[PDB]
Structure formats: C-alpha cells, structure tokens
C-alpha cells in the first residue's frame with residue numbers, strides 16, 4: 001500500500017474457513033488493534049499447480065476496488081513458505097452458510113441481496129472487471145447484514161476468450177463459458193439469475209448429479225420453477241437465464257425491475 005507488512009505484525013485468531021489453497025483467519029494488527037481477516041496461501045501448493053499468476057490478478061484487481069458491497073483487499077506479504085492476503089473482515093460469514101441455515105430466503109431478503117449484488121457488479125463492470133464466479137460460497141455478509149462480493153479468484157478483464165480449465169461446479173457458469181467460447185460482462189448477469197433462483201428455491205436451477213448432465217441442462221437452459229416462486233420472480237429469472245448473452249438485461253434494468261423495487265429494502 002505504502003508500506004510492508006510481516007506475520008509478526010498480526011496476532012492470529014479463530015479459523016474462519018476454507019480451503020485447499022490455505023485457510024482464512026480472523027486476525028488483529030498489533031499496533032492499531034485493527035481487526036481483519038488474513039488469508040494464508042501456501043506457495044508450495046500454488047506452484048504444484050502453477051496458479052501463481054492468477055493470484056497476482058486477483059490481488060491486483062481486488063485491491064483497487066472501493067465499493068461497500070465488495071470485500072476490501074488492503075495488501076499482502078509473503079515469507080519463505082506462504083503468501084498472506086490482508087482482508088476486510090466480514091463479521092456475519094458466508095451467504096452459503098445463511099442459505100443452509102434458512103434453507104431458503106424470502107422475496108424481501110433475495111431482492112435486497114440481488115440489489116446489493118447488482119450495485120457491486122455495476123461498479124465492477126465500469127472498470128471492465130468481470131467476476132465470473134458469483135456463488136453463495138463467495139459472498140460474505142457485513143456487520144449490517146449487507147452482501148459483499150468476496151472472492152475474486154476467477155475475475156478477469158473484459159472482454160475475454162479464455163478456455164480456463166473449468167474444474168469446479170458448473171452450476172453458476174453460462175452457456176458461452178462451459179462451451180469455452182468468448183464472453184463479456186453478460187456472464188455475471190446469467191450468474192445473477194442463477195443466484196436469484198437459488199436464493200428463493202434453495203438449490204441452483206441447473207443442479208444435477210453429474211457434471212456431464214449439469215453441462216447439458218445449462219447449454220439447453222432447462223430449468224423449472226417450484227409452485228411457490230412468484231410471477232415477478234419467475235419473470236426476472238427468465239429474463240436473466242437467456243442462452244443468448246445479448247438478450248440478457250442490463251444491470252440497470254435488473255435494479256429497475258418491478259419485482260426488485262417492490263421487494264427490495266435497499
């Protein structure tokens with residue numbers, strides 16, 4: 001930032017969670033007593049998979065973003081064996097844990113999260129950063145219960161054509177990404193529809209038991225709605241889950257959607 005941290009500057013605390021790169025810890029900076037989170041990546045592990053350059057992207061991108069619905073990255077440092085990310089600490093944990101708790105969210109809490117997400121993504125898109133990995137496990141909650149986009153591990157500059165070896169769940173990836181094609185900001189609009197659906201239903205709309213058939217359901221956009229999903233909600237999700245990226249709405253239209261405005265507290 002201006003100056004260079006070391007492990008000895010921080011008292012480390014409770015393990016927050018993760019993960020196979022290394023874990024995330026609550027920590028406190030000794031001199032200021034500032035409370036934050038410290039993500040410990042293992043180097044040996046980053047190099048037994050040559051991901052060292054992706055971290056530099058994540059770090060570079062996330063550190064330059066200022067938005068109340070995006071998790072701050074303050075800086076980083078390393079020693080012999082590992083790298084440390086100094087992160088804003090989000091006190092209420094992941095959206096996933098919350099979703100697991102409530103099983104599903106009401107329309108008011110979904111619309112509010114979608115709004116918060118939409119604002120954060122709009123900001124991202126103004127810098128032509130595209131996220132590409134929006135999902136409950138990557139979204140944290142602030143002290144006021146506000147959604148924060150947390151993990152920028154897969155974010156990248158737009159437009160992009162990468163055939164990134166897609167290794168985790170397909171559940172949030174749009175057709176143009178699973179088929180390995182070129183893609184832009186509209187990726188995050190598809191993911192926003194997947195998320196909106198998952199928030200209301202409790203499961204992502206293309207969920208399946210194998211990767212191979214999730215792939216099929218996505219590329220053919222086969223989802224159905226349980227009876228309890230309201231018309232307004234169905235309408236927004238159908239607008240978002242469009243095979244053709246150019247037919248997906250702009251974030252502005254998401255924000256101005258009657259189902260959003262009627263239910264959003266934000």
Ligand SMILES: O=C(O)c1ccc(Nc2nccc(Nc3ccccc3OC(F)(F)F)n2)cc1
Pocket residue numbers: 016017018024037087088089090091092093094097137138139140150151
């Ligand atoms: O369950 C809890 O007690 C809990 C309480 C507070 C926080 N808060 C928190 N603040 C900053 C970073 C961070 N990483 C993280 C932690 C666990 C899983 C995934 C993570 O990374 C992410 F968010 F990027 F995915 N977690 C997280 C969890």
